[PDB]
Ligand binder design. Structure first.
Ligand SMILES: Nc1ncnc2c1ncn2[C@@H]1O[C@H](COP(=O)(O)OP(=O)(O)OP(=O)(O)O)[C@@H](O)[C@H]1O
Ligand SMILES: Nc1ncnc2c1ncn2[C@@H]1O[C@H](COP(=O)(O)OP(=O)(O)OP(=O)(O)O)[C@@H](O)[C@H]1O
Lengths: 311, 311
């Protein structure tokens, strides 16, 4: 097996220009705040499985690794809101994640607000990264509960620290709900999936560097005329479904001792990770799926909105 | 009677490839942690009566028998959380199980956290095995109380010692509740029941080696065309109900001096241990139960989820 080779196939990061744009803006957002004046506050949108969490994890490592190794400093944070979050819930989650208080027994919302305003300049917080902002949309109705948004405005104005709220694109209406919180988050970037198949685009050079990063020694066959068309036909832009197929195909080619990823175990990997794919979607790998013009259209505008459009 | 023979029938371990996978990963999880850097932290799921407690007991014996015989060292632990556990409750249970403090009079959660962090490197703890993780799911509501989970993250980061949390499959949502605790427990294995009857599978060789291990001298008749079909028809994959039937049949054949386990006392053992079995299930042993295609389907995906799906 060589689980070292398996973890090498699973932990493969390839920097796209969109990711490097987000990382440059994140480094900018941090280094601009003097923690006296009002911070910059970026909002980053992005659909289901574009690589937002990977961006936050890549930033976390490249920023706070040596500083966390130095001592209890924790310069940048990573917060994942709970579903249908109250200000007290997201406040105490922010508290128990940041350093080591108790903070989750005494829930009175005011004294724990005083605690984390006492503690944020104490440890030396430079940035707050919130991952889930679509949780403030109620599930079945379309009201967006503005208690956490107003509390975020409160904690932003009380202790001047830059907040980079990540979320799905239909979380925009939560920022549209509060006009003050809308005015605060000026910088808005859209981390949207891969665009076209025609070749010599960002998708080809991405698959070229991922072909380089795969643990096979000689070639993996990606980013050629035939296989790139079949790859985009399987996974439109969704980074996660593409990486899942490549991961399942890689570990399949590792299991039965092979040369590289070939058109032997890729078909098996396609039939394996085609459970989530929609009703009218066709698997381009099986017996005789002539990959069409209609399969290779760019992803729509409302790609990460559909759950909001469903009600 | 010969209670020696009875204890021989009761204590019968047969290693499956799934159990050897869990034991190899457990030995790996222990021997990788240097107790300076962040440990590996495996999660092992498994339904109601797959043989989790037998795996922990087999590991406990094969690991810590000679070291516990040497002196007060206790390298590996075995912890069974109480129901609706608070951090102080599971903390003091961990304390009073590990070595010999008093530890269960002074409940202040902070000084006993300090006590067990003082004591874990003192005695030389190498591994912590937690058996019940589904207790952190509240009974009638579907909130999963995250105080014990956050305390487990706390004790993991404070003293770097590998924790192998066992539990039922619907305990997964407790690991989904805390994103940091989710990120920590990377290695996740599913100890699921036996799959098919068709023959020449893991079930046949399992019953072959269990036929060997039984205290009868000549044969027990298991893992043949007829009896294997009747055996899977009685107990789908549930190791405990299979082993109970075999145990009751064995001690029935021991009571009235017999040659082996025959189709005389097996019918009596079937009617004896068929109380727990569901409403629509049929006993394949009684008078004329022609064992059908519909009886021998593999166990479902959500085999250990049903109590979570009930509310
Ligand atoms: N630049 C990259 N190179 C290679 N793989 C990548 C890259 N970016 C992301 N991935 C992969 O994409 C997958 C998507 O996981 P991730 O959780 O980051 O997505 P996400 O968009 O945050 O999902 P969600 O919206 O559900 O939170 C991961 O398996 C990750 O390894
Ligand atoms: N490999 C094996 N060979 C023979 N018998 C086994 C094997 N594994 C488990 N058993 C038997 O299966 C039964 C189940 O016991 P055990 O408590 O280990 O299951 P469990 O899934 O942990 O149950 P619970 O979750 O209720 O604690 C025991 O009687 C044990 O002897």
């Amino acid at each position: 097996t060589r689980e070292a080779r398996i973890s090498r196939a699973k932990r493969a990061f390839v920097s796209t220009p969109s990711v490097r744009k987000i990382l440059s803006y994140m480094d900018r957002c941090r280094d601009l705040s003097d923690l006296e004046s009002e911070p910059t506050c970026m909002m980053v949108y992005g659909a289901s499985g574009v690589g937002k969490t990977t961006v936050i994890k890549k930033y976390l490592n490249q920023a706070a690794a040596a500083a966390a190794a130095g001592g209890d400093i924790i310069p940048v944070l990573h917060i994942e809101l709970p579903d249908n979050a109250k200000p007290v819930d997201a406040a105490r989650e922010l508290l128990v994640e940041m350093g080591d208080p108790l903070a989750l027994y005494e829930t009175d919302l005011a004294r724990l607000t005083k605690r984390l305003t006492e503690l944020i300049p104490a440890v030396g917080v430079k940035l707050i990264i919130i991952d889930e902002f679509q949780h403030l949309v109620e599930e079945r109705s379309n009201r967006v509960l503005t208690q956490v948004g107003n509390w975020l405005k409160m904690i932003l104005n009380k202790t001047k620290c830059p907040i980079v709220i990540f979320g799905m694109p239909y979380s925009k209406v939560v920022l549209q709900a509060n006009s003050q919180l809308h005015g605060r988050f000026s910088i808005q970037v859209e981390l949207r999936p891969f665009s076209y198949q025609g070749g010599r685009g960002v998708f080809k050079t991405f698959l070229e560097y991922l072909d380089k990063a795969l643990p096979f020694e000689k070639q993996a066959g990606l980013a050629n005329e035939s296989l790139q068309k079949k790859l985009y036909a399987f996974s439109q832009g969704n980074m996660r479904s593409l990486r899942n197929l490549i991961y399942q195909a890689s570990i399949e080619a590792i299991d039965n001792q092979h040369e590289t990823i070939t058109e032997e175990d890729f078909v098996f990997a396609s039939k394996l990770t085609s459970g989530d794919k929609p009703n009218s979607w066709k698997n381009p790998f099986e017996e005789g799926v002539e990959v069409t013009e209609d399969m290779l259209r760019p992803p729509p505008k409302d790609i990460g909105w559909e759950d909001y459009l469903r009600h």
